[PDB]
Symmetry: none
């Protein structure tokens, strides 16, 4: 169980500053020691901050931790390429008697203009339905920074199963792409009036819809 | 770390792996132990609490035990989706804070090759009405995470407009990618069909889509 909320994405131009907030409650962030972890691409997560504001060895003074009430923050000044990573907050929860973690934040050092994703929502193909299978594909392309949050709905109701979203990858145009897909049975697909893919990018959200219809 | 864990444990699929964690009388020996799973690129998730209790929806394969100043996590019948970093957590009554082990990387050895599932989508009516056409070749459940993609317009290679994403580990540590070909509504309607050829571990999977009468 996790109550710790962090922004999915933060970014700034090199030399600038980012702040990564993590909001919790009294049982966790409010009464216990907050740690921060850095997860570099394809690397094991390393402790960078502990006891709210103590830097781990080798971590530059540009990185600073703070805590106010039930929320903790990791601030990074003089932002440089090597700070690009996913960061997450970790804290003891005294009511739960276990550790709770933030959902993580990708930090991007802006090297090009920001671009809103192009969202193209594909219904299940005829060939697929003929095989009693159904896959909804939400193609997400031409975005920068390379981080998206995807949420699917079936008639305004959040989908909690069969969702897979790829990790953004830099394409030939230097912008990112990803696809999110939902595996359903033709019955599940036809039992609902519509399906929606909601794509969040830098606090900007776009929702697209698809419904079962014959050619 | 305050708690001592082995760095790695590796086993063939279906085998039993053991992860032990040692502490003292103030932490493991006194307080309830929890276990955390961290899938590559994701955050740690609690899988075990109160030494032997599984968290919501955690599979039966996972079991936990506690003896004296030690705790063990056992994965019976190992799966490729179990490949993760595992951490032991507990409250230290001496330090009056929560302590963890250094983590154990669980490797699934001699991992079987998994052929990609290939699903090809034509441009939807909505897209074509907006004067656009994108074909998406969805490539899922493969292992290892390397694919080669080639597209054909009728039986002629498509040497432009092709983009394929870098394979990425899905929930089950298998891979997914997607190839997409952007065309004009005219280029789409002109041809009899389009093909997407996926090459994985020297084997090819080809799918074909043609414009419909609407």
């Amino acid at each position: 169980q996790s109550v710790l909320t962090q922004p999915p994405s933060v970014s700034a131009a090199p030399g600038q500053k980012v702040t990564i907030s993590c909001s919790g409650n009294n049982s966790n962030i409010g009464k216990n020691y907050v740690s921060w972890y850095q997860q570099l691409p394809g690397r094991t997560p390393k402790l960078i901050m502990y006891e709210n504001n103590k830097r781990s060895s080798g971590i530059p003074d540009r990185f600073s931790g703070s805590k106010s009430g039930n929320s903790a923050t990791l601030t990074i000044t003089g932002l440089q390429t090597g700070d690009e990573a996913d960061y997450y907050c970790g804290v003891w929860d005294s009511s739960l008697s276990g550790g709770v973690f933030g959902g993580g934040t990708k930090v991007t050092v802006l090297g090009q203009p920001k671009a809103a994703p192009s969202v193209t929502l594909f219904p299940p193909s005829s060939e697929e339905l003929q095989a009693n299978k159904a896959t909804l594909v939400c193609l997400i392309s031409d975005f920068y920074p390379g981080a998206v949050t995807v949420a699917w709905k079936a008639d305004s109701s959040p989908v909690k199963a069969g969702v897979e979203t790829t990790t953004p990858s830099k394409q030939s145009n230097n912008k990112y792409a990803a696809s999110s897909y939902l595996s359903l049975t033709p019955e599940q697909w036809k039992s609902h009036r519509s399906y929606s893919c909601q794509v969040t990018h830098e606090g900007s959200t776009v929702e697209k819809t698809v419904a079962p219809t014959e050619c």
